[PDB]
Amino acid sequence: DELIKKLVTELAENSMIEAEEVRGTLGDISARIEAGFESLSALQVETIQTAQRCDHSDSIRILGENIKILDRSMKTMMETMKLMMEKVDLLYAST
Amino acid sequence: DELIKKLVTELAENSMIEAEEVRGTLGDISARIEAGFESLSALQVETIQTAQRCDHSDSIRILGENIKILDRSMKTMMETMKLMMEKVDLLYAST
Amino acid sequence: DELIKKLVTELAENSMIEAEEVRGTLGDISARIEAGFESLSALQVETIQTAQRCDHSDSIRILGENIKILDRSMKTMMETMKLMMEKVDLLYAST
Amino acid sequence: DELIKKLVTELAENSMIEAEEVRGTLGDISARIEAGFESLSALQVETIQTAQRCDHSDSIRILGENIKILDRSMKTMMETMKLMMEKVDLLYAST
């Protein structure tokens, strides 16, 4: 195995160059994977944080509650109007 | 083919190591693909679930409906005011 | 080049198997890329379509416009009240 | 090393073809990575821009403020009604 091992090395010497170029190419691809995923997920988090600003559950409830306060104040006023009119009716009949 | 097959094995013995290292590298890349896609999609689902909380179609409709109830109560009161005034006008002329 | 070409084939015969297994592995990776991107983008479109349901620009404007109608009706009523009172003042002084 | 180098070239000649086909396949994969990431991120930006249209913080505040103006106008009217009634009471007792 004297001449055999000399040919084993001279063949590895030429393949090792093509193995290095594939390894670098694979690492270039791996770097583009971890860069796309790191970028999109940061943009994705920015989407969730933005969406949260549009949840107006409490704001709309407070508007709703204050419309019902006004409705109750309108009932209170309708009772005060009929009360005033029932005094006016008495004033007319007192002539 | 006695010596031929001895050189075929001694060459496979040295290439098999470089094939294993490429296979492991490919599997490292494949694992990063299924990890990025599993993570981003989970973050993406969290975005849809968050966006749904901002659909206030029904809340805003109930506010709108109760503003129109108040508007109708305001028409009812305007008729009651003119009614009261038309009794006051009669009371003035009765002097 | 008689014996040379016989060794060229017996070496290609053993490498061709390792080339096929890498080609299949590469295609397995390529298929996972086009599957993740096809899935996430479909989920992403579902996010945009969901977000559109939360744009209540017109609904909120119609609420705003009808609150200002009520405000104008309240001004109309305040003028009718002072009008009624200015008739009541005259009725008191007519005694 | 006369015959040795002739076999080194005739072996590189057959491997160089399989190296080119792997290089093209790797580049086909790399192109699908930069295409998916470029597409999804453009769709992701469209999601953020859409979500911003649903932030009605200011619109809802102006509705809230104008409901409280109406509430204050309703208090002003309740004072004017009791004022009118306190003149009507005096008119009844003046008989």
Author numbering:
A (entry chain A), B (entry chain A), C (entry chain A), D (entry chain A): 1 to 95
Quote the passages of the study that discuss this structure, keeping the authors' original sentences.
Using X-ray diffusion and diffraction experiments, we revealed that BoDV-1 P adopts a long coiled-coil α-helical structure split into two parts by an original β-strand twist motif, which is highly conserved across the members of whole Orthobornavirus genus and may regulate viral replication.
BoDV-1 POD crystals (fine plates growing in urchins) were obtained in PEG 8000, only in the presence of calcium chloride. This informed our choice to use a single coiled-coil chain of the measles virus tetrameric POD as a starting model to solve the structure by molecular replacement. It was then composed of two α-helical coiled-coils with all the monomers being parallel, with a break centred at position 126 in the middle of the whole structure. Considering the electrostatic surface of the domain, the break seemed to separate the N-terminal acidic region from the C-terminal more neutral region. In addition, the Ramachandran plot showed that residue D126 fell into the β-area, whereas neighbouring residues (C125 and H127) were in intermediate positions, between the α- and the β-areas.
